[PDB]
Amino acid sequence: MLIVPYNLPLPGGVVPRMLITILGTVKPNANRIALDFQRGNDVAFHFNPRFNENNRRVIVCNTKLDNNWGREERQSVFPFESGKPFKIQVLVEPDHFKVAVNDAHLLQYNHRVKKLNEISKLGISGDIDLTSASYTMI
Ligand SMILES: OC[C@H]1O[C@H](Sc2ccc(Cl)c(Cl)c2)[C@H](O)[C@@H](n2cc(-c3cc(F)c(F)c(F)c3)nn2)[C@H]1O
């Protein structure tokens, strides 16, 4: 439906209580997906499901500053499945981004980029059919 890579502007950046919801379907034989919450050229929060990293499925999260990736945060719970519809919910909390997939909490990512109001774009890329991307204040 929506063209991927997709850019969702986040006017005035993010703030606690802002909820971003992404609906889509993983393509068959998917290799990767990425959500990039950007501050200009920096990536404040990169959320990156990898479907085949040495025959393992893993979600890699990181921050990119001045074109350098930092320390990766990895955990082993992988709720996505090739060919299946998903819902990602990213809730901005005062100290971290809180992520739920298909209504189940997945992970938290502590804020490395501190100027939340300058994280003004969300890029969505990878092996998905993107249905919708929106935000609301809870
Ligand atoms: O840490 C996270 C980064 O890890 C490597 S670079 C690297 C390698 C080793 C280490 Cl120890 C470190 Cl710290 C960094 C990736 O190449 C990088 N990356 C992924 C994508 C990308 C682009 C897409 F278009 C897309 F659809 C997609 F799903 C993904 N672009 N850039 C990013 O995931």
From Swiss-Prot:
What range of the full-length protein does this chain span? 114 to 250 of 250
Tissue distribution is: A major expression is found in the colonic epithelium. It is also abundant in the activated macrophages. Expressed in fetal membranes.
The reply to whether Ligase figures as a keyword in the UniProt entry is no
- Using the UniProt record, give the first listed, main subcellular location: cytoplasm
Indicate which residues form the motif Nuclear export signal: 114-129
Residues annotated as binding a beta-D-galactoside are W69, G70, R71, E72, E73, R74, Q75
| Domain Galectin per the UniProt entry, residue ranges | 6-136
Q: What is this protein called?
A: Galectin-3
**Role description:** Galactose-specific lectin which binds IgE. May mediate with the alpha-3, beta-1 integrin the stimulation by CSPG4 of endothelial cells migration. Together with DMBT1, required for terminal differentiation of columnar epithelial cells during early embryogenesis. In the nucleus: acts as a pre-mRNA splicing factor. Involved in acute inflammatory responses including neutrophil activation and adhesion, chemoattraction of monocytes macrophages, opsonization of apoptotic neutrophils, and activation of mast cells.
Tell me, what is one Gene Ontology molecular-function annotation carried by this entry?
Answer: molecular condensate scaffold activity
**Phosphoserine (modified residue): where?**
S76
